[model samples]
Target: KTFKQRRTFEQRVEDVRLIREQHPTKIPVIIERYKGEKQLPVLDKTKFLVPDHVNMSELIKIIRRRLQLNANQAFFLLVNGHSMVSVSTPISEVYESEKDEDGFLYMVYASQETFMK
Candidate 1:
């Protein structure tokens, strides 16, 4: 596969700013102060290496059983990241609802092994 040419950082930032201005509702503004602090130690992958042969389907089933949900309920939970192991693929990332409602629980698995820890 051929990779596309990369754009300059300034160009990308300008594009993002334009997009945010055009779609204000899609942007979330927040005010926060950052206190300088030492970073936490990273987990050692060697000590916590995930098994290479994990059965995705069986794992999903087990999670569903543990949640005591029917097939439809369990499938929706898996897709929504409510009560199952987080998926790694970008297409499978789930986002919880922002509102405090019944279906408010959501997640976005942006990085691999983020939820493992």
Candidate 2:
């Protein structure tokens, strides 16, 4: 189950509130693998406390490092299961626009080959 599924709505809101209070400059992000993904390795973590100033492109670089991906490995993140957020947009902006009701920004990632090629 996703983070939202494991906790009550109130609990999730409280979680975000407390986290934000302690780390006001950071944005709460939950990144999950695309359900149909095939080539990319699963990340060891799902939750990331990203700095507000970090852009999508930078975040993607960090995630790629976590996966130890090659330079040519094509990867991308999807917001709310659809929108491919702009690479230059900052985390704070994306959070403001896309954060869930429970107060967490949810994202899913997939490589160029989500399905076996």
Candidate 3:
């Protein structure tokens, strides 16, 4: 009989790693302010790397805090330059639908609109 070494347990266990257990991946997003908007601050060339499935409300709140907006001002998030995404939509959907080939997504912010009340 030929001499053969037994396989170690560690090697066998490592082969069963599921895809979900892989390292987390972050999504890159670019923010732009609409021209003629006075309330928006200038965030120059900063790319936001968020979790894979972040929602609009979470992003809105993060930017609102970053820009230091008050309670009276309104905030709107838009993609494709002229369209707006709802608060409940998954950010990945927007990113995938309108992102450039470089895998960078662009978001435009518009503040100071009021609802008819």
Candidate 4:
């Protein structure tokens, strides 16, 4: 039988820092919200930076935070113009496949009824 050995506190901290720095870089995405641009102007923002490994819902969370939206403010996310992705879907694939010629991932957001139920 083999037993694992624990490293010193400083060694552990240094390892954590190395792991953090080694993580795949953040991805850039372009999000366009088509909600009430006039009355709900706060919904519109631009240029989001997201880590490469998060699920679909994380992007929504980021959007909500950036837009300063409340919990009741429901929004739907879309890609490829009309295709909607599941909240559990991996975001990296979406970014890789759906990014536009400008090297930006194109995303659209609207009210829940427009896309999500």
- Give RMSD to native, each candidate: 16.4, 1.8, 15.9, 14.8
Per-residue error for 114 in candidate 1, Å, reads: 18
Better of 2 and 3 by TM-score: 2
- Give the CA lDDT, 0 to 100, for residue 32 in model 3: 70
lDDT of each: 0.29, 0.86, 0.63, 0.63
lDDT of 1 at 50: 17
Q: Which stretches of candidate 4 lie over 4 Å from their true place?
A: 1-24, 35-39, 42-45, 113-117
Q: How large an RMSD does model 2 have?
A: 1.8
**What is the alpha-carbon lDDT for the whole of candidate 4?**
0.63
Model 2, 67-107: lDDT tens digits are 89999998878997678978999888999999999899998
Best by lDDT: 2
Sorted by TM-score (best first), the order is 2, 3, 4, 1
**Poorest stretch of ten by lDDT in candidate 2:** 108-117
TM-scores for candidates 1 onward, in order: 0.22, 0.89, 0.68, 0.65
Off by over 4 Å in 3: 1-24, 113-117
TM-score of the candidate numbered 2? 0.89
Model 1 is weakest, by summed lDDT over 10 consecutive residues, at 29-38
Error of 3 at 9 (Å): 48
Clashes of 4: 0
lDDT of 2 at 65: 92
